[PDB]
Amino acid sequence: HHHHTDPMVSKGEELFTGVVPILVELDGDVNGHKFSVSGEGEGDATYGKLTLKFICTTGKLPVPWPTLVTTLVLCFSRYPDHMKQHDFFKSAMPEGYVQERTIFFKDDGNYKTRAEVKFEGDTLVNRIELKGIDFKEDGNILGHKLEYNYNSHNVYIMADKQKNGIKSNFKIRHNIEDGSVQLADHYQQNTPIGDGPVLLPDNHYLSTQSKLSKDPNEKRDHMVLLEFVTAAGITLGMDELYK
């Protein structure tokens, strides 16, 4: 997937041709419950497809697995050909980028996360620190009242020219077991690790869909994740190719 007239686009797309192995490492502390998660799988940016299996390595996960989905690699998003000049995530590779979030759970606590996403050899690595505070010990999160499923979202991306990066704010809706919803308001910033140039995007969004499952042979606390992410929101000329 190398053939683009912009050699900067070609550089990033070359790194994500074919299937790329992924390693995810998370160290977490929510209301003083310390935990760690390790994940492995593969990403295929041509289809916007991620397949990952996560394991809690400290025992039982003290929060619901769905609450960690957004924290646990947007460089695997499928950017349509006419939008590839807006793919900040791949342009920052292989040196990588920092991804920082604050996630406000409505009427509950908040997660603060900081992750470095970069290549180690052939492997795309996402290393995360998560701090969670101000949770109600029997609210929907520490009370484990969320359904084991996941909804589709739109992640709106804007350039942050002051930071040579991007910002995003989006809402995640978690289904509660009683039929209601737990809102999680996400605030995000990404900045490159390297000092080289990056692609700064026009406003656009990522459309996400995720399926959560379990490994029937796995006795450890875990989550299997299938996710598709596609960029959208920018049109193509010339006014119009099909008009």
PDB file of C-alpha atoms in Angstrom:
ATOM      1  CA  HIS A   1       0.000   0.000   0.000  1.00  0.00           C
ATOM      2  CA  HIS A   2       2.899   2.288  -0.947  1.00  0.00           C
ATOM      3  CA  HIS A   3       1.752   4.107  -4.094  1.00  0.00           C
ATOM      4  CA  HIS A   4       0.960   7.696  -3.170  1.00  0.00           C
ATOM      5  CA  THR A   5       2.196  10.881  -4.813  1.00  0.00           C
ATOM      6  CA  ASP A   6       3.069  12.362  -1.421  1.00  0.00           C
ATOM      7  CA  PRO A   7       6.274  10.698  -0.146  1.00  0.00           C
ATOM      8  CA  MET A   8       5.250  11.558   3.417  1.00  0.00           C
ATOM      9  CA  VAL A   9       2.033   9.576   2.995  1.00  0.00           C
ATOM     10  CA  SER A  10       4.026   6.763   1.384  1.00  0.00           C
ATOM     11  CA  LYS A  11       6.345   6.528   4.382  1.00  0.00           C
ATOM     12  CA  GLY A  12       3.549   6.006   6.906  1.00  0.00           C
ATOM     13  CA  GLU A  13       1.466   3.721   4.694  1.00  0.00           C
ATOM     14  CA  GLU A  14       4.505   1.503   4.050  1.00  0.00           C
ATOM     15  CA  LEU A  15       4.773   0.766   7.770  1.00  0.00           C
ATOM     16  CA  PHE A  16       1.163  -0.442   7.954  1.00  0.00           C
ATOM     17  CA  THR A  17       0.950  -2.563   4.822  1.00  0.00           C
ATOM     18  CA  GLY A  18      -0.031  -6.066   5.802  1.00  0.00           C
ATOM     19  CA  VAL A  19      -0.684  -7.425   9.266  1.00  0.00           C
ATOM     20  CA  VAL A  20       1.223  -5.843  12.165  1.00  0.00           C
ATOM     21  CA  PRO A  21       1.651  -7.533  15.575  1.00  0.00           C
ATOM     22  CA  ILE A  22       0.496  -5.516  18.586  1.00  0.00           C
ATOM     23  CA  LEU A  23       1.534  -5.643  22.228  1.00  0.00           C
ATOM     24  CA  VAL A  24      -0.393  -3.703  24.875  1.00  0.00           C
ATOM     25  CA  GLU A  25       0.787  -3.173  28.446  1.00  0.00           C
ATOM     26  CA  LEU A  26      -1.251  -1.305  31.031  1.00  0.00           C
ATOM     27  CA  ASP A  27      -0.482  -0.518  34.658  1.00  0.00           C
ATOM     28  CA  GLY A  28      -3.517   0.755  36.499  1.00  0.00           C
ATOM     29  CA  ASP A  29      -4.637   2.083  39.849  1.00  0.00           C
ATOM     30  CA  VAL A  30      -8.344   2.812  40.389  1.00  0.00           C
ATOM     31  CA  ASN A  31      -9.279   4.011  43.881  1.00  0.00           C
ATOM     32  CA  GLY A  32      -6.166   2.226  45.139  1.00  0.00           C
ATOM     33  CA  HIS A  33      -6.962  -1.097  43.434  1.00  0.00           C
ATOM     34  CA  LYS A  34      -3.756  -1.799  41.512  1.00  0.00           C
ATOM     35  CA  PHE A  35      -3.888  -3.967  38.421  1.00  0.00           C
ATOM     36  CA  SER A  36      -2.032  -4.720  35.220  1.00  0.00           C
ATOM     37  CA  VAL A  37      -3.244  -5.820  31.787  1.00  0.00           C
ATOM     38  CA  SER A  38      -1.267  -7.412  28.958  1.00  0.00           C
ATOM     39  CA  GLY A  39      -2.643  -7.726  25.453  1.00  0.00           C
ATOM     40  CA  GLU A  40      -1.545  -9.291  22.195  1.00  0.00           C
ATOM     41  CA  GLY A  41      -2.962  -9.395  18.725  1.00  0.00           C
ATOM     42  CA  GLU A  42      -2.737  -8.016  15.233  1.00  0.00           C
ATOM     43  CA  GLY A  43      -3.794  -4.938  13.307  1.00  0.00           C
ATOM     44  CA  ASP A  44      -4.578  -4.677   9.606  1.00  0.00           C
ATOM     45  CA  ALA A  45      -4.881  -1.009   8.673  1.00  0.00           C
ATOM     46  CA  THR A  46      -5.981  -1.832   5.118  1.00  0.00           C
ATOM     47  CA  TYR A  47      -9.309  -2.981   6.581  1.00  0.00           C
ATOM     48  CA  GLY A  48      -9.202  -0.888   9.757  1.00  0.00           C
ATOM     49  CA  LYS A  49      -9.257  -4.171  11.647  1.00  0.00           C
ATOM     50  CA  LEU A  50      -7.895  -4.955  15.114  1.00  0.00           C
ATOM     51  CA  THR A  51      -7.982  -8.333  16.841  1.00  0.00           C
ATOM     52  CA  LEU A  52      -6.700  -8.302  20.439  1.00  0.00           C
ATOM     53  CA  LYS A  53      -6.840 -10.527  23.512  1.00  0.00           C
ATOM     54  CA  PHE A  54      -6.230  -8.879  26.882  1.00  0.00           C
ATOM     55  CA  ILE A  55      -5.434 -10.598  30.165  1.00  0.00           C
ATOM     56  CA  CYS A  56      -5.486  -9.150  33.658  1.00  0.00           C
ATOM     57  CA  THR A  57      -2.139 -10.282  35.043  1.00  0.00           C
ATOM     58  CA  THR A  58      -2.798  -9.342  38.684  1.00  0.00           C
ATOM     59  CA  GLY A  59      -5.892 -11.501  39.159  1.00  0.00           C
ATOM     60  CA  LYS A  60      -9.448 -10.185  38.930  1.00  0.00           C
ATOM     61  CA  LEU A  61      -9.890  -6.906  37.075  1.00  0.00           C
ATOM     62  CA  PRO A  62     -11.325  -4.410  39.611  1.00  0.00           C
ATOM     63  CA  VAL A  63     -13.249  -2.434  36.955  1.00  0.00           C
ATOM     64  CA  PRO A  64     -15.463  -3.634  34.076  1.00  0.00           C
ATOM     65  CA  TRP A  65     -13.567  -4.626  30.943  1.00  0.00           C
ATOM     66  CA  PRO A  66     -15.679  -2.331  28.710  1.00  0.00           C
ATOM     67  CA  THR A  67     -14.394   0.698  30.625  1.00  0.00           C
ATOM     68  CA  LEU A  68     -10.852  -0.011  29.366  1.00  0.00           C
ATOM     69  CA  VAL A  69     -11.598  -0.492  25.664  1.00  0.00           C
ATOM     70  CA  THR A  70     -10.756   3.037  24.571  1.00  0.00           C
ATOM     71  CA  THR A  71      -7.579   3.068  26.658  1.00  0.00           C
ATOM     72  CA  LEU A  72      -6.292  -0.302  25.428  1.00  0.00           C
ATOM     73  CA  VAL A  73      -4.094   2.127  18.774  1.00  0.00           C
ATOM     74  CA  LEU A  74      -5.722   4.474  16.290  1.00  0.00           C
ATOM     75  CA  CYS A  75      -2.811   4.094  13.852  1.00  0.00           C
ATOM     76  CA  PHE A  76      -4.714   1.004  12.617  1.00  0.00           C
ATOM     77  CA  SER A  77      -7.664   3.109  11.415  1.00  0.00           C
ATOM     78  CA  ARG A  78      -8.499   2.739   7.742  1.00  0.00           C
ATOM     79  CA  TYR A  79      -8.078   6.121   6.100  1.00  0.00           C
ATOM     80  CA  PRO A  80      -9.704   6.267   2.644  1.00  0.00           C
ATOM     81  CA  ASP A  81      -7.239   7.075  -0.114  1.00  0.00           C
ATOM     82  CA  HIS A  82      -8.559  10.628  -0.523  1.00  0.00           C
ATOM     83  CA  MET A  83      -8.045  11.247   3.215  1.00  0.00           C
ATOM     84  CA  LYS A  84      -4.583   9.753   3.732  1.00  0.00           C
ATOM     85  CA  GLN A  85      -2.972  13.195   4.012  1.00  0.00           C
ATOM     86  CA  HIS A  86      -4.934  13.578   7.285  1.00  0.00           C
ATOM     87  CA  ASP A  87      -3.583  10.444   9.017  1.00  0.00           C
ATOM     88  CA  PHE A  88      -1.629  11.932  11.908  1.00  0.00           C
ATOM     89  CA  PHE A  89      -1.329   8.559  13.623  1.00  0.00           C
ATOM     90  CA  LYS A  90       0.668   6.794  10.936  1.00  0.00           C
ATOM     91  CA  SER A  91       2.736   9.891  10.119  1.00  0.00           C
ATOM     92  CA  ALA A  92       4.196   9.919  13.643  1.00  0.00           C
ATOM     93  CA  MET A  93       5.591   6.384  13.158  1.00  0.00           C
ATOM     94  CA  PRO A  94       7.882   4.665  13.816  1.00  0.00           C
ATOM     95  CA  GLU A  95       9.074   7.037  16.575  1.00  0.00           C
ATOM     96  CA  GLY A  96       5.492   7.140  17.816  1.00  0.00           C
ATOM     97  CA  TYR A  97       3.165   9.430  19.702  1.00  0.00           C
ATOM     98  CA  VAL A  98       1.929  10.113  23.205  1.00  0.00           C
ATOM     99  CA  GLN A  99      -1.796   9.669  23.767  1.00  0.00           C
ATOM    100  CA  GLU A 100      -3.229  11.373  26.860  1.00  0.00           C
ATOM    101  CA  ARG A 101      -6.815  11.242  28.039  1.00  0.00           C
ATOM    102  CA  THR A 102      -9.099  12.255  30.835  1.00  0.00           C
ATOM    103  CA  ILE A 103     -12.274  10.158  30.899  1.00  0.00           C
ATOM    104  CA  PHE A 104     -15.141  11.520  33.006  1.00  0.00           C
ATOM    105  CA  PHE A 105     -17.701   8.905  33.997  1.00  0.00           C
ATOM    106  CA  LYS A 106     -20.906  10.832  34.529  1.00  0.00           C
ATOM    107  CA  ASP A 107     -21.905  10.894  38.208  1.00  0.00           C
ATOM    108  CA  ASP A 108     -18.815   8.847  39.023  1.00  0.00           C
ATOM    109  CA  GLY A 109     -15.015   8.997  38.959  1.00  0.00           C
ATOM    110  CA  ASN A 110     -12.503   9.717  36.242  1.00  0.00           C
ATOM    111  CA  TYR A 111      -9.649   7.932  34.510  1.00  0.00           C
ATOM    112  CA  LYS A 112      -6.457   9.759  33.639  1.00  0.00           C
ATOM    113  CA  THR A 113      -4.337   7.909  31.106  1.00  0.00           C
ATOM    114  CA  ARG A 114      -1.005   8.411  29.413  1.00  0.00           C
ATOM    115  CA  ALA A 115       0.272   6.052  26.762  1.00  0.00           C
ATOM    116  CA  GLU A 116       3.225   5.826  24.420  1.00  0.00           C
ATOM    117  CA  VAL A 117       2.498   4.153  21.093  1.00  0.00           C
ATOM    118  CA  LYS A 118       5.513   3.238  18.992  1.00  0.00           C
ATOM    119  CA  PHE A 119       7.258   0.438  17.129  1.00  0.00           C
ATOM    120  CA  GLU A 120       9.673  -1.899  18.909  1.00  0.00           C
ATOM    121  CA  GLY A 121      11.169  -3.674  15.938  1.00  0.00           C
ATOM    122  CA  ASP A 122       8.245  -5.032  13.924  1.00  0.00           C
ATOM    123  CA  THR A 123       5.809  -4.854  16.837  1.00  0.00           C
ATOM    124  CA  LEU A 124       3.446  -1.961  17.510  1.00  0.00           C
ATOM    125  CA  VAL A 125       3.511  -1.353  21.273  1.00  0.00           C
ATOM    126  CA  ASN A 126       0.981   0.542  23.382  1.00  0.00           C
ATOM    127  CA  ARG A 127       2.324   1.154  26.924  1.00  0.00           C
ATOM    128  CA  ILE A 128      -0.214   2.778  29.237  1.00  0.00           C
ATOM    129  CA  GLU A 129      -0.406   4.191  32.742  1.00  0.00           C
ATOM    130  CA  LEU A 130      -3.912   4.629  34.120  1.00  0.00           C
ATOM    131  CA  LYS A 131      -4.944   6.472  37.288  1.00  0.00           C
ATOM    132  CA  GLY A 132      -8.568   6.378  38.397  1.00  0.00           C
ATOM    133  CA  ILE A 133      -9.955   8.458  41.245  1.00  0.00           C
ATOM    134  CA  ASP A 134     -13.215   9.564  42.870  1.00  0.00           C
ATOM    135  CA  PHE A 135     -15.196   6.424  41.982  1.00  0.00           C
ATOM    136  CA  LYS A 136     -18.181   5.357  44.076  1.00  0.00           C
ATOM    137  CA  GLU A 137     -17.378   1.951  45.531  1.00  0.00           C
ATOM    138  CA  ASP A 138     -20.813   0.680  44.445  1.00  0.00           C
ATOM    139  CA  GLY A 139     -21.529   2.874  41.426  1.00  0.00           C
ATOM    140  CA  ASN A 140     -21.724   1.335  37.984  1.00  0.00           C
ATOM    141  CA  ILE A 141     -17.942   0.970  37.667  1.00  0.00           C
ATOM    142  CA  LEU A 142     -16.653  -0.428  40.954  1.00  0.00           C
ATOM    143  CA  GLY A 143     -20.059  -2.127  41.325  1.00  0.00           C
ATOM    144  CA  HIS A 144     -19.644  -4.014  38.022  1.00  0.00           C
ATOM    145  CA  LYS A 145     -23.050  -3.084  36.660  1.00  0.00           C
ATOM    146  CA  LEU A 146     -22.011  -2.641  33.017  1.00  0.00           C
ATOM    147  CA  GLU A 147     -23.039  -5.090  30.313  1.00  0.00           C
ATOM    148  CA  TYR A 148     -20.260  -6.973  28.522  1.00  0.00           C
ATOM    149  CA  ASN A 149     -20.783  -5.349  25.142  1.00  0.00           C
ATOM    150  CA  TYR A 150     -19.862  -2.218  23.271  1.00  0.00           C
ATOM    151  CA  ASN A 151     -21.476   0.421  21.097  1.00  0.00           C
ATOM    152  CA  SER A 152     -20.426   2.181  17.897  1.00  0.00           C
ATOM    153  CA  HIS A 153     -19.065   5.709  18.135  1.00  0.00           C
ATOM    154  CA  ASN A 154     -17.779   8.711  16.246  1.00  0.00           C
ATOM    155  CA  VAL A 155     -14.415  10.066  17.375  1.00  0.00           C
ATOM    156  CA  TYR A 156     -14.007  13.633  16.168  1.00  0.00           C
ATOM    157  CA  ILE A 157     -10.404  14.647  15.425  1.00  0.00           C
ATOM    158  CA  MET A 158      -9.089  18.215  15.261  1.00  0.00           C
ATOM    159  CA  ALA A 159      -5.615  19.559  14.706  1.00  0.00           C
ATOM    160  CA  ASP A 160      -3.786  21.133  17.650  1.00  0.00           C
ATOM    161  CA  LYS A 161      -1.293  23.215  15.678  1.00  0.00           C
ATOM    162  CA  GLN A 162       0.207  24.672  18.875  1.00  0.00           C
ATOM    163  CA  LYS A 163       1.265  21.164  19.971  1.00  0.00           C
ATOM    164  CA  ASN A 164       2.102  19.753  16.511  1.00  0.00           C
ATOM    165  CA  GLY A 165      -0.561  17.190  17.374  1.00  0.00           C
ATOM    166  CA  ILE A 166      -4.247  16.492  17.550  1.00  0.00           C
ATOM    167  CA  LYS A 167      -7.060  16.690  20.036  1.00  0.00           C
ATOM    168  CA  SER A 168     -10.340  14.862  20.301  1.00  0.00           C
ATOM    169  CA  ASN A 169     -13.426  14.873  22.481  1.00  0.00           C
ATOM    170  CA  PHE A 170     -16.074  12.181  22.200  1.00  0.00           C
ATOM    171  CA  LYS A 171     -18.706  10.402  24.249  1.00  0.00           C
ATOM    172  CA  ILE A 172     -18.721   6.690  24.927  1.00  0.00           C
ATOM    173  CA  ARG A 173     -21.999   5.095  25.997  1.00  0.00           C
ATOM    174  CA  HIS A 174     -21.756   1.989  28.199  1.00  0.00           C
ATOM    175  CA  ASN A 175     -24.878  -0.131  28.532  1.00  0.00           C
ATOM    176  CA  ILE A 176     -25.899  -0.735  32.180  1.00  0.00           C
ATOM    177  CA  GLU A 177     -27.424  -4.099  33.078  1.00  0.00           C
ATOM    178  CA  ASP A 178     -30.780  -2.464  33.894  1.00  0.00           C
ATOM    179  CA  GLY A 179     -31.154  -1.027  30.386  1.00  0.00           C
ATOM    180  CA  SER A 180     -29.813   2.459  31.153  1.00  0.00           C
ATOM    181  CA  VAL A 181     -26.514   3.972  29.986  1.00  0.00           C
ATOM    182  CA  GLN A 182     -23.339   5.141  31.684  1.00  0.00           C
ATOM    183  CA  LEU A 183     -21.816   8.049  29.794  1.00  0.00           C
ATOM    184  CA  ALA A 184     -18.026   8.368  29.621  1.00  0.00           C
ATOM    185  CA  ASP A 185     -16.870  11.742  28.306  1.00  0.00           C
ATOM    186  CA  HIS A 186     -13.425  11.449  26.684  1.00  0.00           C
ATOM    187  CA  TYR A 187     -10.914  14.273  26.308  1.00  0.00           C
ATOM    188  CA  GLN A 188      -7.843  13.354  24.318  1.00  0.00           C
ATOM    189  CA  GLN A 189      -4.615  14.881  23.067  1.00  0.00           C
ATOM    190  CA  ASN A 190      -1.889  13.264  20.968  1.00  0.00           C
ATOM    191  CA  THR A 191       1.609  14.604  20.422  1.00  0.00           C
ATOM    192  CA  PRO A 192       4.520  13.130  18.447  1.00  0.00           C
ATOM    193  CA  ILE A 193       7.499  11.598  20.213  1.00  0.00           C
ATOM    194  CA  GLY A 194       9.871  12.491  17.398  1.00  0.00           C
ATOM    195  CA  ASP A 195      10.806  15.968  16.278  1.00  0.00           C
ATOM    196  CA  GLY A 196      10.226  15.269  12.573  1.00  0.00           C
ATOM    197  CA  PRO A 197       7.251  16.571  10.616  1.00  0.00           C
ATOM    198  CA  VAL A 198       3.824  15.007  10.982  1.00  0.00           C
ATOM    199  CA  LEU A 199       0.590  15.228   9.020  1.00  0.00           C
ATOM    200  CA  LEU A 200      -1.796  17.677  10.682  1.00  0.00           C
ATOM    201  CA  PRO A 201      -5.392  16.830   9.748  1.00  0.00           C
ATOM    202  CA  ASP A 202      -8.369  18.863   8.736  1.00  0.00           C
ATOM    203  CA  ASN A 203     -11.368  18.176  10.970  1.00  0.00           C
ATOM    204  CA  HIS A 204     -12.745  14.670  10.440  1.00  0.00           C
ATOM    205  CA  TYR A 205     -13.957  11.723  12.461  1.00  0.00           C
ATOM    206  CA  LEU A 206     -13.297   8.048  13.047  1.00  0.00           C
ATOM    207  CA  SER A 207     -16.268   5.693  12.994  1.00  0.00           C
ATOM    208  CA  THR A 208     -15.787   2.750  15.356  1.00  0.00           C
ATOM    209  CA  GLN A 209     -17.432  -0.614  15.897  1.00  0.00           C
ATOM    210  CA  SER A 210     -16.328  -3.143  18.499  1.00  0.00           C
ATOM    211  CA  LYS A 211     -17.307  -6.678  19.458  1.00  0.00           C
ATOM    212  CA  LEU A 212     -16.377  -8.104  22.860  1.00  0.00           C
ATOM    213  CA  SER A 213     -16.102 -11.839  23.399  1.00  0.00           C
ATOM    214  CA  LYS A 214     -14.587 -14.474  25.665  1.00  0.00           C
ATOM    215  CA  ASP A 215     -12.082 -17.268  25.033  1.00  0.00           C
ATOM    216  CA  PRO A 216     -13.896 -20.432  26.227  1.00  0.00           C
ATOM    217  CA  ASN A 217     -10.573 -22.078  27.150  1.00  0.00           C
ATOM    218  CA  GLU A 218      -9.228 -19.106  29.146  1.00  0.00           C
ATOM    219  CA  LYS A 219      -9.476 -19.257  32.949  1.00  0.00           C
ATOM    220  CA  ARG A 220      -7.786 -15.910  33.597  1.00  0.00           C
ATOM    221  CA  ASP A 221      -9.866 -12.734  33.629  1.00  0.00           C
ATOM    222  CA  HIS A 222      -9.721 -11.491  30.053  1.00  0.00           C
ATOM    223  CA  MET A 223     -11.362  -9.747  27.105  1.00  0.00           C
ATOM    224  CA  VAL A 224     -11.251 -10.570  23.400  1.00  0.00           C
ATOM    225  CA  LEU A 225     -11.735  -7.541  21.196  1.00  0.00           C
ATOM    226  CA  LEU A 226     -12.588  -7.236  17.524  1.00  0.00           C
ATOM    227  CA  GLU A 227     -12.627  -3.643  16.378  1.00  0.00           C
ATOM    228  CA  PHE A 228     -13.058  -1.769  13.097  1.00  0.00           C
ATOM    229  CA  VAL A 229     -12.129   1.898  12.770  1.00  0.00           C
ATOM    230  CA  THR A 230     -12.699   3.902   9.584  1.00  0.00           C
ATOM    231  CA  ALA A 231     -11.954   7.558   8.953  1.00  0.00           C
ATOM    232  CA  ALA A 232     -14.706   9.654   7.401  1.00  0.00           C
ATOM    233  CA  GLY A 233     -16.099  13.166   7.095  1.00  0.00           C
ATOM    234  CA  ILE A 234     -14.096  14.538   4.151  1.00  0.00           C
ATOM    235  CA  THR A 235     -15.500  14.600   0.605  1.00  0.00           C
ATOM    236  CA  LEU A 236     -13.722  14.143  -2.730  1.00  0.00           C
ATOM    237  CA  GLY A 237     -13.778  16.300  -5.865  1.00  0.00           C
ATOM    238  CA  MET A 238     -14.066  17.269  -8.542  1.00  0.00           C
ATOM    239  CA  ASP A 239     -17.652  18.332  -7.781  1.00  0.00           C
ATOM    240  CA  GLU A 240     -18.249  15.414  -8.040  1.00  0.00           C
ATOM    241  CA  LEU A 241     -16.396  12.387  -9.492  1.00  0.00           C
ATOM    242  CA  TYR A 242     -19.819  10.716  -9.811  1.00  0.00           C
ATOM    243  CA  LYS A 243     -21.871  13.763 -10.826  1.00  0.00           C
TER     244      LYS A 243
END
